[PDB]
């Protein structure tokens, strides 16, 4: 189904995003998070949660790449 494919893509993009951010590859990590946000029916709610979790300059960079 389309749903298992999408869940998988969403989760794998997040996991690569987190790993990249942990390595200090902020720009690359953010690019993958923007793919995860793009397939979500609630982008604003994902953005709120990322604002509460990410360092402010990475969140801000996120906002500019969306």
């Amino acid at each position: 189904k389309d749903a298992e494919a999408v869940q998988k893509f969403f989760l794998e993009e997040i996991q690569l995003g987190e790993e990249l951010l942990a390595q200090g590859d902020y720009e690359k990590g953010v690019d993958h998070l923007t793919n995860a946000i793009a397939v979500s029916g609630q982008p604003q709610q994902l953005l709120q949660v990322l604002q509460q979790t990410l360092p402010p300059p990475v969140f801000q960079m996120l906002l500019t790449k969306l």
């Binding site: 997040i14 996991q15 987190e18 942990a22 709120q48 949660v49 990322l50 979790t53």
Partner: peptide
């Protein structure tokens, strides 16, 4: 890792 996945799925 994997935490970011749960926070965002639950969002």
């Amino acid at each position: 890792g994997x935490r970011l996945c749960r926070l965002l799925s639950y969002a």
